[PDB]
Amino acid sequence: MFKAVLFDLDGVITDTAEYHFRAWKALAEEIGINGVDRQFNEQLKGVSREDSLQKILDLADKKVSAEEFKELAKRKNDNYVKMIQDVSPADVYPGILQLLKDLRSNKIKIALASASKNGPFLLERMNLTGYFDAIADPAEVAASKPAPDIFIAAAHAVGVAPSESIGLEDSQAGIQAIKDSGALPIGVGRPEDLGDDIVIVPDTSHYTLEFLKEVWLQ
Numbered sequence: 106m107f108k109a110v111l112f113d114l115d116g117v118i119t120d121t122a123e124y125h126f127r128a129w130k131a132l133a134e135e136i137g138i139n140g141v142d143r144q145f146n147e148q149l150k151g152v153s154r155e156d157s158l159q160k161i162l163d164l165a166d167k168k169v170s171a172e173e174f175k176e177l178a179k180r181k182n183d184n185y186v187k188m189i190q191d192v193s194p195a196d197v198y199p200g201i202l203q204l205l206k207d208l209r210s211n212k213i214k215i216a217l218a219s220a221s222k223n224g225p226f227l228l229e230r231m232n233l234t235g236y237f238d239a240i241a242d243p244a245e246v247a248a249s250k251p252a253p254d255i256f257i258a259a260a261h262a263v264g265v266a267p268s269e270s271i272g273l274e275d276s277q278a279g280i281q282a283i284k285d286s287g288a289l290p291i292g293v294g295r296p297e298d299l300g301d302d303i304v305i306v307p308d309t310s311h312y313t314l315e316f317l318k319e320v321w322l323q
């Protein structure tokens with residue numbers, strides 16, 4: 106049986122992937138880049154704040170000063186932080202709270218593997234911090250998603266091998282990070298976006314301990 110579950114946050118625990126998208130789009134448009142639509146944004150999910158800005162700039166072949174780059178990333182984060190102030194426990198995605206209770210029941214470790222620096226604030230907003238055995242700090246890993254390091258670190262933090270862990274993720278970058286860590290990915294979203302080669306569910310109600318069950322056993 107698997108011994109840990111490694112959770113992405115944005116788009117898995119709650120609908121904050123939508124907020125990051127709206128904030129990145131607004132920022133891109135402020136600098137004249139209009140190509141951040143939902144399809145492009147699939148490239149930004151699970152990517153770090155600086156990496157995301159760089160992808161947006163690269164899409165446009167745009168160069169900015171180092172001072173401007175720093176201000177832009179800060180500008181987007183300040184906007185996103187305002188956007189998330191009223192997130193509450195009512196915003197937890199369906200299935201998630203029960204999954205956390207069911208896992209703790211069954212002595213299965215729970216770790217956060219979010220690229221977001223705002224993750225601990227969000228778990229507090231949703232009254233979920235007490236479910237987590239560890240939160241992997243994304244500032245502490247040398248490489249961000251799609252590198253596997255955050256997932257490896259999360260598994261480590263709870264004393265469980267990545268090979269004995271399931272990783273939940275809504276993004277292309279994150280699914281790749283889970284594959285490369287040795288953990289078993291179960292994505293949430295559209296196969297059109299996330300692939301036909303792993304188990305993908307349409308929404309988080311599917312993330313039951315029974316199903317993780319089911320998938321692990323094969």
Ligand SMILES: O=P(O)(O)OC[C@H]1O[C@@H](O)[C@H](O)[C@@H](O)[C@@H]1O
Nearest residue numbers: 115125150151154220221222223
């Ligand atoms: O800017 P933050 O909060 O540190 O978030 C970094 C990243 O966190 C990830 O969880 C999101 O999928 C990305 O969209 C986001 O860019």
Ligand SMILES: [Mg+2]
Nearest residue numbers: 113115116275
């Ligand atoms: Mg995500």
Ligand SMILES: [Mg+2]
Nearest residue numbers: 234235236237
């Ligand atoms: Mg605690």
